[PDB]
Amino acid sequence: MRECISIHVGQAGVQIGNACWELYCLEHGIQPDGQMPSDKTIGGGDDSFNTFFSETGAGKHVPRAVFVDLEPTVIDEVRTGTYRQLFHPEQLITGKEDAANNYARGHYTIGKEIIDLVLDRIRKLADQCTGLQGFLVFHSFGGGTGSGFTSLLMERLSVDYGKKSKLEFSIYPAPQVSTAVVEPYNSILTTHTTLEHSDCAFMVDNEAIYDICRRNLDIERPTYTNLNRLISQIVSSITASLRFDGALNVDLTEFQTNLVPYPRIHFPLATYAPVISAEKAYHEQLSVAEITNACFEPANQMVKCDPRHGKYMACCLLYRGDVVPKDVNAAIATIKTKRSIQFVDWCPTGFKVGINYQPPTVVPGGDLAKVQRAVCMLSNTTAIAEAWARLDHKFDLMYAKRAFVHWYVGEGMEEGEFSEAREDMAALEKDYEEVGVD
Amino acid sequence: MEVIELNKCTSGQSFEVILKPPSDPSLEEIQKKLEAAEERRKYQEAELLKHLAE
Amino acid sequence: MYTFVVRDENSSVYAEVSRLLLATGQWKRLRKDNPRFNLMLGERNRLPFGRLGHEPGLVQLVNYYRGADKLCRKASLVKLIKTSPELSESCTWFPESYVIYPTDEREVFLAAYNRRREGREGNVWIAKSSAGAKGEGILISSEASELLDFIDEQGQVHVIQKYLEKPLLLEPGHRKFDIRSWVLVDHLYNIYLYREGVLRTSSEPYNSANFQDKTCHLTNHCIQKEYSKNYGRYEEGNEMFFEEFNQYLMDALNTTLENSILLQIKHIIRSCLMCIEPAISTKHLHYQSFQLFGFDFMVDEELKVWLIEVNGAPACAQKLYAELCQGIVDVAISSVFPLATSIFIKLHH
Amino acid sequence: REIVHIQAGQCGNQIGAKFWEVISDEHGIDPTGSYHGDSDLQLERINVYYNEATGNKYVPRAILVDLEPGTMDSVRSGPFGQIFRPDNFVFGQSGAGNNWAKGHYTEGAELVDSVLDVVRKESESCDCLQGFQLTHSLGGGTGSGMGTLLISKIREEYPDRIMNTFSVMPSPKVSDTVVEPYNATLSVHQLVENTDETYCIDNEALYDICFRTLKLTTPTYGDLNHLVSATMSGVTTCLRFPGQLNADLRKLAVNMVPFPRLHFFMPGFAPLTSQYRALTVPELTQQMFDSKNMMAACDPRHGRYLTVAAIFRGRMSMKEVDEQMLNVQNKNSSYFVEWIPNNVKTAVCDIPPRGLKMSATFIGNSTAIQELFKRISEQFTAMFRRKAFLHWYTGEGMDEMEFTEAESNMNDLVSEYQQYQDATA
């Protein structure tokens, strides 16, 4: 058994972390007080769920998680929430004032003053791991903390934990729910600085989640709570292999090995189905073929783009619920004859499939209906480069006038880091072109 | 289209389906950059305070 | 009201569409780089499809289908026809063609050529590439070696295609021609064939002897308007419209344009566009597409119709700009952005 | 995240007093500092503007400054006069005679250390000081000259804190003295350098609104100040109640100010009131963008919006809010610069202001504000080319060169705006 430490940075990272651990407790049968009746080894053990939960002699199951925000209002929710009893003070880290949506303020000005405290709290969790796998890092692209402090943390983690793997869950900025106008700056700066320190990053575009919530959950004006409970479902299906018995993606390394043949191109596209409104009492239950087919609908992707006009490097199907291999292969055979699914010439045209018999868990009283089977597809397609191109274009429009740049320089950042970061994204865009275009 | 590496456990199973075959900065360097940015902030504040003293 | 941007100032068709839209009082034009548009009249090259459909609250429509180049590039069309099961290894309406680079068919081509030589059948082929415009870069040869030599002397991928040695010749004049059909595909992937086509005719008589003279063989409007005398003696601008051509087919061949030719044209349009529909449909996309296509057809002396190429950014006949451009507004634009009989034939599928 | 409020001079104290009356009403605070509200949202961010004293009393974090006692005696006698901390009244006796030099260099110089003592005392009581807001006019002597002196001294002691002002611009239509253009031009230079955000409240616009829209034949400063307190409540709503957007002063400045000098905002409000009919979301959106609803006498159709913040208050369809905001951008698609993507941000607060079931406040960073500075610059030059009324200032130790420099800097500011009004992508 090898442990995984989750790190949640900034408002988005913290609030999504809160939703994920709520869902983990529902999935593993852990009550809000940390007790787990089904766990017969009191105060210890090396079960699959122990990869995410440690144990006290009193029988409490404690998340292997650290929460970090530069202002205390979001993390205080954790402290006074339903699952407050789960964590202890050492795991919650709040500062006095935030990065004001300013990458440079989160990375340089405030990051320098808090990084050693964060590492020390991380070191304490690591010291309880007999075989630490690595870290899962949740954060937004657009916030000053999520962008600026994360990138500093990732650099220091590569130093303090050279051999360990690091995975990201990153919230890509969407104007429909976005606060700041400088988020394209923060996104590019943090991607540039974090690129060589991340083994595999799952981008979630708030635009896509927002649209899924409006279209499938019939929520007129989705809130962060709506968005985060849907995101937590996707995160859960992605980390389930680390927390349950299985043979696919049982180690953080397996994510890189199965999804990332080229280190820089480490942003798999996630697609999830089915998303069904809980307000609908009766809903026709979708088959293996139908939910699998839905993995090739852009409307169900975590980032809106057209995989028909890209190339696949790797493709994983993660099913939860009443699924058997026979149905998966029958569905795949049909979908291949009907869909545009072109792999790069130097990769096998195939799918790694994992099935977990326990159906998805849904928060009681939430917006998602209980389904008998669901699937999350992780596909590394060049089509996700469309999301880099959009971001890079917004960056270019503002930077050509140096709009807002004085805010970053005023925190000690040099103007050259902008163009340096932008040139990195240009190379990234060219890497995707060279891999997926004829 | 063949299936391979079928692993079964009580909680589920996993396998692979093949349709067609194919054809870091140091700690000192980080502290350097952080202190460089802090010094640039200090220089700019010193200019402000000098301007205000004038 | 509705908003649109113009990013191909060189489009005769959409310059008129834009002009029509403004004259409606319900459309406003914005600067080329304003993202808050409802309609993009995009550029022919590098159209930024990946930036469409991400403006909150805007239904966005573009006048090109991403991926339609597969049909409108000479090399890609050959590859698409030979590999698409829907079009099969062999479909009877496209001339035997091969892609030759200076995934290469330089060998299978010579095989069929040698076979024809041994059969002493018509063994005339025409090499061409979508890199040459204005009749530049074509070579009609009876000898295969002359064809390949001409290819290697260039740097563009080329296709070699059997030359229709027995074309249908209009009379008087013993004159070759081709048919241009305009097809509009809307955001729902309805296929609308404009009721008015045009024949682009050769002014000089067809000479099956020497192919050196690239005039009586190439029916392109520019080659006739500059390289051939008597340009315009038979009809204005070497362009015959369907009423006259239909009347001719009746008088000369006791048949109609619909029966002898248009059935095959409609079949070929359907087959091509239905083939690529899974790959380019915007039915479940965050933005929608329509596109106007120019299909080019040959007719042989047996009244069999052959597809020659598909143009993705076609121009229009001067007499037909108004009607067709108005049709674009009604069928493709106003259908998505409503205001306050039919010139198209809907090809059901 | 505490804000420290400062009000200086006659205008600054009369407008500031009304501001505290209005928001004290919204947060449920009575004239004696006792809370008698009915919703927890009133108190969640009460600390931003109020200190808590024993007995669960709430004391405005407000400092009242003037060089004569008259107006501050009125405040202390006014409706909520007893709610202010008595130590926070700091005043002289000489007055400043509508003279920027007296406020900034002579009379004001003598009093400023006492003001900074009180400011330091409020700051020291803040768990995490967010910054300062100053209410003042630019046309007089104390608010203009001493107000900008205070901002400079505050910037010196608290260089890393945000400085925001509500600055009342003079107009010949609502004028006390001919020297107002001198005082305002001298002050604008200070503001260009030493504030992060300045709400430009134009007494010309306020008069026009009272006259043309509110149908007040003879507007008084009381009538104009009703518009200002309503506007100040609107623009501080996102600071005073739970919210995601422009939550604190620094995040707001980051989203509103693309270039450091261009931080002068045109505020707007709807509905304009001085009526029982419900106002629909479309009406709110159309009005708040209408030039007639702007508090600075500038036509937004004459320039372009760099950034816009819009705050909707009341219970309303947030879907309709997004729908109308996205709509109006298309009706004015050309008046938003295209090189700042998504530069219009919208916030909603369920608490409506007193007497309205819903309302909308508009905050625009528009290049059209250059019209306001051009107006001031012309009035300044008409007198300065003849050195008229200068002796009032040279008599206080000032030299003509200082006027020449202030005028140059404001013309630079105008040409800065014009530069970005012509800029395209």
Ligand SMILES: Nc1nc2c(ncn2[C@@H]2O[C@H](COP(=O)(O)OP(=O)(O)OP(=O)(O)O)[C@@H](O)[C@H]2O)c(=O)[nH]1
């Ligand atoms: N999906 C989702 N997105 C969020 C959430 N909270 C914030 N965001 C998004 O994150 C971006 C803003 O970054 P934040 O995480 O709020 O900022 P921060 O990391 O706390 O850093 P600061 O600037 O110091 O506040 C915007 O694009 C928001 O839409 C959340 O709970 N769920």
Ligand SMILES: Nc1ncnc2c1ncn2[C@@H]1O[C@H](COP(=O)(O)OP(=O)(O)CP(=O)(O)O)[C@@H](O)[C@H]1O
């Ligand atoms: N296989 C063939 N057999 C007989 N004639 C042919 C032929 N291929 C081409 N032609 C003749 O050559 C002319 C030009 O060929 P092609 O269509 O490749 O050029 P092009 O791409 O310029 C057409 P357009 O002017 O519409 O763009 C055609 O109009 C036709 O008359």
Ligand SMILES: Nc1nc2c(ncn2[C@@H]2O[C@H](COP(=O)(O)OP(=O)(O)O)[C@@H](O)[C@H]2O)c(=O)[nH]1
């Ligand atoms: N809106 C408004 N403007 C005022 C008020 N009092 C004065 N003014 C304006 O402020 C300027 C006069 O400055 P004032 O504040 O009275 O002088 P000070 O005491 O030295 O700061 C002129 O432009 C007046 O029109 C007021 O109560 N409301």
Ligand SMILES: [Ca+2]
């Ligand atoms: Ca145990």
Ligand SMILES: [Ca+2]
């Ligand atoms: Ca590493």
Ligand SMILES: [Ca+2]
């Ligand atoms: Ca004295």
Ligand SMILES: [Ca+2]
């Ligand atoms: Ca002192």
Ligand SMILES: [Mg+2]
């Ligand atoms: Mg935050």
Ligand SMILES: [Mg+2]
């Ligand atoms: Mg062509």
Ligand SMILES: [Mg+2]
């Ligand atoms: Mg006065």
